[PDB]
Design brief:
With 237 residues, the chain is mostly beta strands. The strands form 5 sheets. Strands 2, 4, 5, 6, 9, 10 and 11 form a 7-stranded mixed β-sheet that branches. Strands 13, 17, 18, 19, 22, 23 and 24 form a 7-stranded mixed β-sheet that branches. The protein is globular, with a radius of gyration of 18 Å. It has 2 domains: 121 residues, Immunoglobulins (Immunoglobulin-like, Sandwich); 99 residues, Immunoglobulin-like (Sandwich), CATH 2.60.40. It contains no helices and 24 strands.
Amino acid sequence: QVQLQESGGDLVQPGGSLKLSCAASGFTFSSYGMSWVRQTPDKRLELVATINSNGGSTFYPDSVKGRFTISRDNAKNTLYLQMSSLKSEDTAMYYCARRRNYPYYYGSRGYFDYWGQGTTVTVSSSDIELTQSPASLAVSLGQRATISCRASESVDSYGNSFMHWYQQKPGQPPKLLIYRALNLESGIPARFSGSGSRTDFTLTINPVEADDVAIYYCQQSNEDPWTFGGGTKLEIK
């Protein structure tokens, strides 16, 4: 019964302000770091703000730093995003997402285990780059699908790789499949497997079923900002 639910999206003019809210339920909100991640019309995912569990420390990528403020009211189990000086580039679906850093060990980096359904914002008229290949593939039922992600620099530290894989279907947020390159998320079928290290990672789906038609995203958490690859669309031939 973990739920996140965003509100506040609207049509805004350039230069305008807008405040988004994300209301959490079904867990101890103060125990978890949180982020806002937006999905632009080109289907890219971009972290725009992140906050620690106690709300005292915050991080923003260069794209939005100085314009956006993330905050949390732990008593009200709510996350906020105050947006100002809005620009065309800010038009996107905005998601809040919960950070999970598990198992926990020295240097361990987290990933997103829960997402809200998103709220739409429309503005009227040295980051690590992850490149996926192929951008699109079609396979027959029962075949393997092999999706590659290459990072611009290594995403390894402490003997481990902080690369994760998500699945996204239409109308839905991303869903975590694989964390830290090779660990299968609870509830995810064993036909999904991840491999790789340093700069070179692979998601293998074998055998593919019709339920696996989706866009698949890699994401690194070895450095801030956390960054996502551009997605790979899987269809059935």
